[PDB]
Amino acid sequence: YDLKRLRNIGIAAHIDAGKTTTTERILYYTGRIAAVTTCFWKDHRINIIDTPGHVDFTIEVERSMRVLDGAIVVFDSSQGVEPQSETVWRQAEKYKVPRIAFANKMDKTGADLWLVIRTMQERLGARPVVMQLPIGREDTFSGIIDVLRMKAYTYGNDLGTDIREIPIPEEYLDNAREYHEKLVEVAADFDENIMLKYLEGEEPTEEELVAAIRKGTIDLKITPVFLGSALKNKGVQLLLDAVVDYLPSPLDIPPIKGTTPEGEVVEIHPDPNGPLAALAFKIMADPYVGRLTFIRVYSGTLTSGSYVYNTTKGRKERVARLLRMHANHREEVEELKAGDLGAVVGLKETITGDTLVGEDAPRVILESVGKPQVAYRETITKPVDVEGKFIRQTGGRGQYGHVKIKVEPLPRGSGFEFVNAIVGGVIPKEYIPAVQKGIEEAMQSGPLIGFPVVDIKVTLYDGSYHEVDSSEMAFKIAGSMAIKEAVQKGDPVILEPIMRVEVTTPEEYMGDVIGDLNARRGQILGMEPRGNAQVIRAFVPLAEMFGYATDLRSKTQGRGSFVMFFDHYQEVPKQVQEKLIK
Ligand SMILES: Nc1nc2c(ncn2[C@@H]2O[C@H](COP(=O)(O)OP(=O)(O)O)[C@@H](O)[C@H]2O)c(=O)[nH]1
């Protein structure tokens, strides 16, 4: 265990760009010596954190980004930068996570390195550095030129069983020659001594270059780009050498922030010999060990067969075993130091997102079929004074329940309030519970659209009863009926949820999106930057947002993105109410 030799990476890519094939291929070359698979490359341990299938599911994505250190963005070189690529690309920036790119499918028809380099700076605002040059196109792609070391590689087949270093062929000797010089320029921007050498026509050393490019890559200023064909086993190991050469180690990135029990909010460093701070990010019920809980250790060591405190749930837990998932097998270990990750068997209360610390350690908390229908709520507007009355011969015996209540509207969000104002026993004390229950039962489904009635204040103040005919049932119905008429005669109004949205669209559609929203009864609050895109935010009724995704696309070329969360309830406009009633 060396902290510098760890590489926690994620593989982000638009659907079909080749995340699976790339990942699988990596496990194959890494192997011929799962939330978090592990493997080795040149004495480095690479932990491949699995990333969310659809980048749209925000919650998971930001968690993933948070647990991984570096990332590999995979592109389909016949398509260039795609929509999901942008989404996941803004996300990475949002979390300052170093990247490198892989131009996959260089064997496919239409595959072109330059389409990717261009689209990258065009759409994403990136400053790509060409690190390799292909040798051949589509069906003839067969080699790779390493522009930084001036080396060429040829693959004798699509099986990955033949690779030879060759001299840079003559037809590419000039092309490679200038990109090397361009490479040296970029490096010079991060290493003063390289510039001096550049100015006086002196070739810097690979170490200098690699170091410089690495520094740039980690600082989030450049983006090394590599290419190959996963499906045809071309470039895979060079891509692995890249992850070691440029992606960061737990040490190269900014410390994670923790909010303690007082809010002093302090940073926690990857010290193996310091308090134990860890986070569970994915739970999976394994069939051989039952319930696996994956975690990322930020600080201190976690040992097998020990106790840990789950600072989020207050609970306490026993760490039975510590497992490591490899390509084709499991491995059991006595520990997991800081900056490392693995599975933990034993936890019972810990769920996705919870923080775990050592027993005697700083209690810090690292984180905080039908058709889809809206959650409506009914309520009233003016105070009312009605009466419930159930009187009739049902079941041989008479029935008689009579209640008089005063219902009055309460401040939005005040809830419910019941008052017993009866006196002189006009209603037998034994029936009050019946009356109350009839009321809370009828509030479950309002008379306007059948949704829970809310923010009202009921007050039982009168009624009558029969010596023999009264009964609990009678007073339950009468209380029920009373409330129903209370809501009908109280100038009722439907309330609806108002979400606060967040739409990120390149300023090219600016006025288009902020125009469609208003068509959904929204209300623009403000705007701001976020790279090449603009972040629009407003209050849109949840009813108007159904299917917004397959709408924002056909109005942003799929380059649009949004997230929304409940904000408050508000009375629907008279027009909209009238409609709903139908
Ligand atoms: N020709 C070619 N096609 C590829 C390559 N990598 C992936 N594909 C194909 O792309 C499709 C999607 O692959 P996949 O790895 O599942 O991508 P994902 O959907 O991002 O996980 C499959 O049909 C692959 O066989 C490549 O380097 N060359």
**24 C-alpha to center of ligand 1: Å?**
11
Nearest by Cα to 154 from 240, 42, 235: 235
CA–centroid distance for 433 within its chain: 47
Nearest by Cα to 19 from 58, 64, 66: 64
**Annotation-wise, does 69 bind a ligand?**
no
Within a domain: residue 342? yes
**17 C-alpha to center of ligand 1: Å?**
6
Q: Please measure the distance between the N-terminal and C-terminal CA atoms of the chain and give it in whole angstroms.
A: 68
123 ligand 1 Cβ < 6 A = no
| Same domain (yes/no): 537, 420 | no
| Same domain (yes/no): 423, 545 | no
- With contact defined as beta carbons under 8 Å apart, do 500 and 539 qualify? yes
Q: Which residue has the tokens 């084709």?
A: 328
By three-state DSSP, how is residue 563 classified?
A: strand
Within a domain: residue 332? yes
- With contact defined as beta carbons under 8 Å apart, do 242 and 214 qualify? no
Question: Is residue 234 classed exposed, middle or buried when 0-12, 13-18 and 19+ CB atoms within 10 A define those classes?
Answer: buried
| Same domain (yes/no): 96, 152 | yes
**Annotation-wise, does 106 bind a ligand?**
yes
- Site to probe by mutation for ligand 1, drawn from 14, 20, 21 as the one with most ligand atoms within 8 Å of Cβ, is 21
| Same domain (yes/no): 402, 482 | yes
| Same domain (yes/no): 412, 344 | no
**558 C-alpha to center of ligand 1: Å?**
21
479 ligand 1 Cβ < 6 A = no
**221 C-alpha to center of ligand 1: Å?**
29
DSSP 171-189: GGHHHHHHHHHHHHHHHHT
Structure tokens at 407: 């219902």
Within a domain: residue 65? yes
**Annotation-wise, does 19 bind a ligand?**
yes
Structure tokens at 372: 């889809």
| Same domain (yes/no): 363, 383 | no
Pick from 332, 367, 402: which residue ends a domain?
367
6 ligand 1 Cβ < 6 A = no
CA atoms in the 13 A half-sphere facing the CB of 353: 8
- DSSP run (H or E) holding 519: none
How many whole angstroms separate alpha carbon 571 and alpha carbon 455? 12
409 ligand 1 Cβ < 6 A = no
Within a domain: residue 216? yes
| Same domain (yes/no): 236, 275 | no
CATH (domain of 342): 2.40.30.10
| Same domain (yes/no): 450, 542 | no
Which atom of ligand 1 lies at the shortest distance from residue 228's CA? 27
- Site to probe by mutation for ligand 1, drawn from 11, 16, 87 as the one with most ligand atoms within 8 Å of Cβ, is 16
CA atoms in the 13 A half-sphere facing the CB of 126: 29
Neighbours of 554 (CB within 10 A): 9
Structure tokens at 156: 């004798």
Nearest by Cα to 443 from 464, 458, 459: 458
Identity of the residue numbered 194:
I
Question: Is residue 103 classed exposed, middle or buried when 0-12, 13-18 and 19+ CB atoms within 10 A define those classes?
Answer: buried
Q: Where are the beta strands (DSSP E) in 203-360?
A: 223-227, 256-258, 266-268, 277-284, 292-299, 302-303, 306-309, 316-319, 321-326, 329-333, 335-336, 341-345, 355-358
- With contact defined as beta carbons under 8 Å apart, do 217 and 98 qualify? yes
How many whole angstroms separate alpha carbon 14 and alpha carbon 33? 31
Identity of the residue numbered 436:
Q
| Same domain (yes/no): 132, 234 | yes
| Same domain (yes/no): 399, 384 | yes
Atom 8 of ligand 1: nearest residue by CA position: 18
Pick from 430, 460, 495: which residue ends a domain?
495
13 ligand 1 Cβ < 6 A = yes
Which atom of ligand 1 lies at the shortest distance from residue 74's CA? 20
Nearest-5° Cα angle at 419, 414 to 424 = 170
- With contact defined as beta carbons under 8 Å apart, do 506 and 530 qualify? no
- With contact defined as beta carbons under 8 Å apart, do 12 and 60 qualify? no
| Same domain (yes/no): 42, 152 | yes
CATH (domain of 383): 3.30.230.10
How many whole angstroms separate alpha carbon 450 and alpha carbon 444? 8
Paired sense of beta strands 6-13 and 44-49, if any: parallel
CATH (domain of 534): 3.30.70.240
Paired sense of beta strands 493-506 and 524-526, if any: unpaired
With b meaning 16 or more CB within 10 Å and e meaning fewer, what string describes 449-458? Answer: eebebbbbbb
Pick from 461, 495, 529: which residue ends a domain?
495
Atom 26 of ligand 1: nearest residue by CA position: 105
CATH (domain of 162): 3.40.50.300
Question: Is residue 580 classed exposed, middle or buried when 0-12, 13-18 and 19+ CB atoms within 10 A define those classes?
Answer: middle
**12 C-alpha to center of ligand 1: Å?**
14
Count of structural domains, the chain: 4
Within a domain: residue 264? no
DSSP state of 167: P
Within a domain: residue 262? no
By three-state DSSP, how is residue 64 classified?
A: helix
Neighbours of 410 (CB within 10 A): 16
Within a domain: residue 284? yes
**Annotation-wise, does 14 bind a ligand?**
yes
Cα four-point dihedral sign 558, 504, 111, 14:
negative
Neighbours of 115 (CB within 10 A): 18
Neighbours of 515 (CB within 10 A): 12
Could you give the C-alpha distances from 142 to 107, 153, 160, 174, in angstroms and in order? 8, 8, 12, 19
Question: How was this one solved?
Answer: X-ray
Nearest by Cα to 340 from 22, 45, 40: 45
How many whole angstroms separate alpha carbon 536 and alpha carbon 414? 32
Range of 385's domain?
377-495
105 ligand 1 Cβ < 6 A = yes
How many whole angstroms separate alpha carbon 215 and alpha carbon 189? 10
* Contacts of 382 by beta carbon, 8 Å cutoff, 6+ apart: 409, 490, 491
229 ligand 1 Cβ < 6 A = yes
Neighbours of 345 (CB within 10 A): 18
Could you give the C-alpha distances from 104 to 139, 257, 291, in angstroms and in order? 14, 35, 36
Q: Which residue has the tokens 């997102």?
A: 353
Q: Where are the beta strands (DSSP E) in 203-243?
A: 223-227
**Annotation-wise, does 474 bind a ligand?**
no
Which atom of ligand 1 lies at the shortest distance from residue 230's CA? 27
- With contact defined as beta carbons under 8 Å apart, do 111 and 77 qualify? yes
Within a domain: residue 120? yes
21 ligand 1 Cβ < 6 A = yes
How many whole angstroms separate alpha carbon 420 and alpha carbon 436? 9
Q: Which residue has the tokens 């410390």?
A: 255
How many whole angstroms separate alpha carbon 180 and alpha carbon 200? 16
| Same domain (yes/no): 491, 515 | no
Cα four-point dihedral sign 547, 552, 557, 561:
negative
Cα four-point dihedral sign 549, 552, 557, 559:
negative
